[PDB]
Structures are given as structure tokens and as C-alpha cells.
Design goal:
Chain lengths: 225, 225
């Protein structure tokens, strides 16, 4: 099938481990510290992954950073969603960090995680494929609506290249549903909505000052408010 | 062209006037009171308009209300956006209520209105047509991601019917761009993002208690938090 899709598939990063500190007592602070540390390491991986998206590295450094600073949480959330598709009412933040309802309550994350589970529910019913997941991650990055873009036409071109990939993939692989590509695009509003909820929640956690956060995660959280 | 599109066009409501009270001194409270009163009357019109969308009235009353309670602010914002396309850096909330940057500052709405102007900017560059605007309003209603839907399959059918209308419209009217339908769908995340910003802002205004609000607007604001 479509080459961009195959390319994004082979560029997909390996999963990483959350490694919650086994010497630390379980608490909301430990859960939030674990999650923010995991996100920080995933953001390094995301920055490396984006260089494989056709045309991304040719943008200016400022436009590359603007796209990432707008889209980073959507990309993180799409990952948890995809890893959680074979599960029921649990979120696989990592293989060693699977959050059920009780854990979400303990972390203060019941509302955020229920919103993520709504994304999971919809993708389950659509039978989201890995091919579609990796293409949607790239589309979310290109379509992230940053206010600070320099070369608007080159970013529009990146959106078009990735949108064409999804269109071509669905036309070849899913002839039974001539509207599947659009159905996939129509899941992007709920992704944006959930990401905004997550950014606001963790920005408040940042302000409260009780959860330590690393440099990159803080810089992404700060580029967004 | 497509019959659903033509139908939504002829079902389009007439514009209404804001009628800011000429006896009241200009202030943030007057501006916010004027806007909330205008939105309340538009919501009555929106409820009547939705009955013309194929299949909407056959949903249950609860599903009809759930869709409207999720989508109402996106529909309101799409209207201001469309009315503002021929303007520059001003928002035509109504023919008699056009907000420039100074007025937005006075109302406490500079950030919200700048976000709406970002939607306007994108639709300007795409040369958004009235046909596309009315179809996107209906798609936003059907795709509003309510957590409380009873007949999920009938709502998915409504989404598909409206999505097919946009696809068919663009395939017939815009052969020069085989990805225009998807481009239109890809504007929906920023619409959802801006609507969430507006709902949160006016919910805070509701809590502060200094701006009087009418029953329907309050009930839509309360169904969302
Ligand atoms: O893959 C990850 C890792 C951490 C976090 C998310 C996704 C999203 C919610 C914020 C925490
Ligand atoms: O057509 C309208 C009328 C009033 C309002 C909006 C749209 C949206 C922002 C909240 C106020």
C-alpha cells in the first residue's frame, strides 16, 4: 500500500518503560511524577521520530518547534490510546504502567483518563489499525494549528502530503467504506479536546509545585500557556 | 449539486440583531450581557434549524438534546466566523454588533476573539463557501462527541449522511482539489478548541454573577460542566 504509511510504520519508535520507583510509597505525587517523567522521555523520542516525516526536517527549526509545541500532547495521548485498544477500561501508559479506574482516582486523573477512554472506545469501534494510528499521529503534528508558523504554505503542504497518504491508504485497503478516511479525520476534534484537558491539568500541577518535572516536559507545558 | 447541501442552504436561518441597549453605558458588563442575550436567541433558532437536518428529528429527544448540548457553541462560533469572512480583524457577531480589537479588550474577550479570528483566517485562505459552512455546521452537530448518546449507531449514521454530502459536494464542485473535503474536516479541531475556550470563559462569567443570563443559554452552559 501507500509508501508514506509504510515509512511511518517502520519509523515507529520502540515502546519505553515507565519504571515507577519501587522504593517510593504509592501516592498521587508518585503517580504524577511517574507520568511526567515518562512523558519527558517520550518527548525526546517524538522529536527524533518527527525527522522521519517527509518534509518535516526541511521546515525551519522555528516551524518544527512550533508544530511540536502545539501537537506534543495529542501525540502522547494517541500513543496511550493505541496501546490501550486491546484492554477494557484501562490505560496502558506503558507496559509496566497500566491505569485502571481506582488508580486514576488515586492520581487525581479520573476525568482526564475517562476522556482518553472515550477516544479508545471510538477507535475500538472503528477497528483502528497501526497504519492509521501512525498516519494520524503525523497528521495531528502537521494540523496542530500553531499561531506562530513562519512558512504557512510549507506547513499546508505537509498537511496535504499526510492527508493524501491517509486517503490513498483507505482507498486501497478499505474499499468497503469510501468514507473511512474522513471518519478517521473526524476523530481529531476529540483528540484535540482531550489534549487541551490534559495540558490544562498538568499545567495546574506544574503551578502547585508538588510534582517535580524535567526540562523538556516543562518547556512543552510552558510553550502552551 | 448535492441535495443535502441545497437543503441545508434553504434551511439557513435569517440573521438576527444584537440590539445593544442604547440607554446603558458602554462597559464590559453591557458587552457581555449583549452577547449572552444574542446567543440565547440564536440558540432558539439553532434548535429549530436542526429539525431540518435529515434524520435529526427521528433521533430520540434525549439524543437530540445531547447533540445540541455538546455542539451549541461550535455552531454559534461557526456563524460569527462565516459572517466575518469579508471583514479584517473584526468579528461580526451581528450586523449591528461588530467587535474590533479595542472592543474585545473592553469586554475581556481579546483572547477568545483572537482565537475566533484564527478560524476566520484559515477559512479565508480556503475560500469557504456558504454551501460548505452550512454543511460543516451540521457535521459539527452530529460529530459533537457527547458522552450521553443512547442510539450510537443512529448518530453515526447521521454523521455519515452529512459527511457523504460534503464529500459529494466537493467531488462535484471542486475537482481541482481532490482533498478539499478532508481539508474542510481538518478545520474541525480548531473549531472544537475555540468552542471549549468560549464555554469555559462564559461559564466563569456565569459564576461571577455580574452578567445576567437567560434560561436556555444557562441550560446549555450548565449541560457542559
Ligand atoms: O504516553 C504518555 C505518557 C505520559 C502522559 C501521557 C501520555 C498523557 C497524559 C499526560 C501524561
Ligand atoms: O453568534 C454568537 C453570539 C454570541 C456568542 C457567540 C456567537 C459566541 C461566543 C459567545 C457569544
Amino acid at each position: 500500500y501507500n509508501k508514506i504509511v509504510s515509512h511511518l510504520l517502520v519509523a515507529e519508535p520502540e515502546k519505553i518503560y515507565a519504571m515507577p520507583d519501587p522504593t517510593v510509597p504509592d501516592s498521587d505525587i508518585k503517580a504524577l511524577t511517574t507520568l511526567c517523567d515518562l512523558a519527558d522521555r517520550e518527548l525526546v523520542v517524538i522529536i527524533g521520530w518527527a525527522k522521519h516525516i517527509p518534509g518535516f526536517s526541511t521546515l525551519s527549526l522555528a516551524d518544527q518547534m512550533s508544530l511540536l509545541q502545539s501537537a506534543w500532547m495529542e501525540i502522547l495521548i494517541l500513543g496511550v490510546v493505541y496501546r490501550s485498544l486491546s484492554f477494557e477500561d484501562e490505560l496502558v501508559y506503558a507496559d509496566d504502567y497500566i491505569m485502571d479506574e481506582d488508580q486514576s482516582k488515586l492520581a487525581g486523573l479520573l476525568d482526564l483518563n475517562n476522556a482518553i477512554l472515550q477516544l479508545v472506545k471510538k477507535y475500538k469501534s472503528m477497528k483502528l489499525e497501526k497504519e492509521e494510528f501512525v498516519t494520524l499521529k503525523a497528521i495531528a503534528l502537521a494540523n496542530s494549528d500553531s499561531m506562530h508558523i513562519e512558512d504557512v504554505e510549507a506547513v499546508q503542504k505537509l498537511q496535504d502530503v499526510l492527508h493524501e497518504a491517509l486517503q490513498d491508504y483507505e482507498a486501497g485497503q478499505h474499499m468497503e467504506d469510501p468514507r473511512r478516511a474522513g471518519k478517521m479525520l473526524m476523530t481529531l476534534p476529540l483528540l484535540r479536546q482531550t489534549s487541551t484537558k490534559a495540558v490544562q491539568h498538568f499545567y495546574n500541577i506544574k503551578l502547585e509545585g508538588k510534582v517535580p518535572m524535567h526540562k523538556l516536559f516543562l518547556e512543552m507545558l510552558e510553550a502552551k500557556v
